[PDB]
Write a protein that binds this ligand. Sequence first.
Ligand code: A1AK4
Length: 169
Amino acid sequence: EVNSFSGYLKLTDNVYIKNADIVEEAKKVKPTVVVNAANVYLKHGGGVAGALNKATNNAMQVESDDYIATNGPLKVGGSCVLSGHNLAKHCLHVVGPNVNKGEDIQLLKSAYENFNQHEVLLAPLLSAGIFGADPIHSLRVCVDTVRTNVYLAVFDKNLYDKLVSSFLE
Ligand SMILES: CNC(=O)c1cccc(-c2cc3c(N[C@H](c4ccc5c(c4)S(=O)(=O)CCC5)C(C)C)ncnc3[nH]2)c1
């Protein structure tokens, strides 16, 4: 079966959310697109990006280095489409701003706008965790910006509960 997402909670007509590890979701669903929470040189050194790359046994990193060699780095707020390897048909590498490193939070809207080029996506909550954005704010930007069908996997039950309670106020 195609894009067989299970156990999500529908927030809006096109945004769904689950307490889950995006890696485990990608292995089980094999979505058309999985979003990586990338940086501009596509160096998948830790967190979500490191986990997705490890699940490909480093194939994603080798492919990413080849892309950067030919094309140069991405911009903050930008994206590129590469192979999804064993995780998906395609991986959409999206660079959200890292506000812990001084990048402008306004670029989070630009980052989510990249999702609109794909009908269905499995994605993490952009710029959350160690990128330093307020995760409640990131969910609001996602809801207001994404118009295609997005399935958010958030790997922390405490944060999941806080996000759902915020959405339902
Ligand atoms: C097999 N699994 C692993 O090897 C593994 C190991 C180690 C980690 C994971 C893993 C983490 C994680 C996740 N974290 C969220 C999150 C969202 C966005 C960003 C980050 C973190 S960041 O990496 O800190 C910076 C980039 C933006 C947290 C809860 C807010 N959300 C979904 N799926 C996840 N998976 C799997």
